[PDB]
Design a protein around this ligand. Sequence first.
Ligand SMILES: *C/C=C(C)/C=C/C=C(C)/C=C/C1=C(C)CCCC1(C)C
Ligand SMILES: *C/C=C(C)/C=C/C=C(C)/C=C/C1=C(C)CCCC1(C)C
Ligand SMILES: *C/C=C(C)/C=C/C=C(C)/C=C/C1=C(C)CCCC1(C)C
Lengths: 224, 224, 224
Amino acid sequence: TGRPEWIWLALGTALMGLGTLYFLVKGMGVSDPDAKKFYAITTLVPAIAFTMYLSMLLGYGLTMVPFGGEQNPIYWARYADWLFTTPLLLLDLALLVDADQGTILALVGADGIMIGTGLVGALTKVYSYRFVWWAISTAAMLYILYVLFFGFMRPEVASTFKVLRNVTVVLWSAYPVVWLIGSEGAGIVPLNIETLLFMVLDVSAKVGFGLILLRSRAIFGEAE
Amino acid sequence: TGRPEWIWLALGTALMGLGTLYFLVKGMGVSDPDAKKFYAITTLVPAIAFTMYLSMLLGYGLTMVPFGGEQNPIYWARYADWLFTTPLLLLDLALLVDADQGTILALVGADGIMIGTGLVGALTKVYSYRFVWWAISTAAMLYILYVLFFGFMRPEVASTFKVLRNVTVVLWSAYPVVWLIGSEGAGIVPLNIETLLFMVLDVSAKVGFGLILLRSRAIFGEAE
Amino acid sequence: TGRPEWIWLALGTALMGLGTLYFLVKGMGVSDPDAKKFYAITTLVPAIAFTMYLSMLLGYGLTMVPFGGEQNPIYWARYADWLFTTPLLLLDLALLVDADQGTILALVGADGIMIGTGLVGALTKVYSYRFVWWAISTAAMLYILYVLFFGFMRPEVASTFKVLRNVTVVLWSAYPVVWLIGSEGAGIVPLNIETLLFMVLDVSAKVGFGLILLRSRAIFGEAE
Ligand SMILES: *C/C=C(C)/C=C/C=C(C)/C=C/C1=C(C)CCCC1(C)C
Ligand SMILES: *C/C=C(C)/C=C/C=C(C)/C=C/C1=C(C)CCCC1(C)C
Ligand SMILES: *C/C=C(C)/C=C/C=C(C)/C=C/C1=C(C)CCCC1(C)C
């Protein structure tokens, strides 16, 4: 199309699609029940992202929100993606460490709150209030990060969890910043650059994260 | 009303309602925990369908989508039904065979993708792109069917699973065809006939499927 | 704002926010896995309510629905809250009594139906039909109440469950009445009083319920 961000949406669609196919093929033949869980979660994540990238590319997942006296292009489909994919990603971490159910519920619920309030902020027509939602969403993210560090095994489990926790902190923490400087927030970075940034983050957080996880012996039960 | 498809919506509402009441009464008194799971899942399915049929009958679950240069009546409430009822139905099959959690997640997630992309296709304003969504949704359905045949007990469990798997393949595979030839897709069959077809499919896939399942000794633990 | 109900929305936001913070601090340090489940569920409930109260206060969670020949202010965000918080509350009760999974699914599903049909009724443009949805929603509520009394331990578990079941029946049963007499239904009580009533009910059903639950020894495994 003639939205300059189309190229990043197209590459995102492609990389999510290819990552989905790769993980699908890779998990073919896996019989270990524990490993199956990780393959399922980890393949579902970019498959969902693929659909939502495509919806943005085709224009379905874009709406105009009036605020600051303009009609502002907001890609709402990102939140529909994140609503499902972010708890899934947290579930991969939580299963790695054999987290308590209470802890999993805390994580999933805080994540739901993070995404839902981010969506509310994204669609809010009173400019100043958009940042209230951003702050609440960010608080939920900080709670999530706190639990990953202070709320929790085989040495390979510890090692893989540590690496993935670090990837998670670094990549996830960038999202509120991009939103804040981008078209959803202060509008200091144009939508095409914002789209590029989220594409790099998303591909790393999904396909990159998944490559790290699915390469590890941590996803298998200890078997002779 | 004066929408000619009202009669099929009314009969669908009635048959789902009656099926719900029948399963409710039938599962009264069931104490076996395994059987309770099947009664719960299986009664919930037509209860949800009853609500969404009624919403279509009353006109709430209908919207107009512009495409191909017309205002096209799209019953969106079907997807709200299917979003919940189709994974529930898959859950009945998966519990019958004591499926791995990874496999259940794969099934539920692929199903979510099937329904969500079908909804996107149903609401998409660019005619040609509607069929892209249809294709992606169909791929998700084919993945689901593949898992039911290649991804998986007491002989009565095997026997009941086999029958229900066959019912599932035959009925579910008809949905993409009806959508394709109907008002959502190529518009070769009118909405009133499309509605009739989905009504027959839905009642069979829910109340018919449920009668088969709930009549079986497979839903009970092996007890003396 | 100049909506007279703003004061009740503001106090609701505050009390849910404070209740969230209190439960969060209170559950700090809890290591018992069973207790963690209850703290997680019970803190998530007012955290979600806090977000949805704030959304109503800020005006995001309000829409106008034409019916009875007027444009009627309907707070839809209540349903988005209840959709998540009501099954969570039922989950607290069900975990207390170690409910069968079938029973939990029945409860959660009936609750989903209660809330979804209440939302449909709230948004329905044909006045008389709003009450059809109300009736169906009420039937789902009555099913839920029936299960809590007829569908189900350590003496402290029994004692706490009994108290919380009674609180639940009394408070939950008031909701259909308020809706019926309020702006969503017959319009005999003005929106500002309706808002006050739901605020008192919600705070009691969430923060009050939670204080009772989290003060009990019932939420802990039996340990030496
Ligand atoms: C695969 C995609 C992922 C891992 C996306 C993660 C996204 C977030 C952590 C987003 C966080 C946000 C906030 C913390 C504040 C408001 C804006 C959001 C939703 C971008
Ligand atoms: C009770 C209702 C059920 C079992 C409905 C099943 C529906 C489907 C399998 C629908 C599939 C579709 C596609 C595969 C492609 C696009 C259109 C859909 C959603 C009708
Ligand atoms: C924390 C909030 C809670 C516990 C809310 C409970 C709400 C209900 C039990 C609402 C019930 C309703 C009906 C039974 C009929 C239609 C209207 C509703 C949704 C208010």
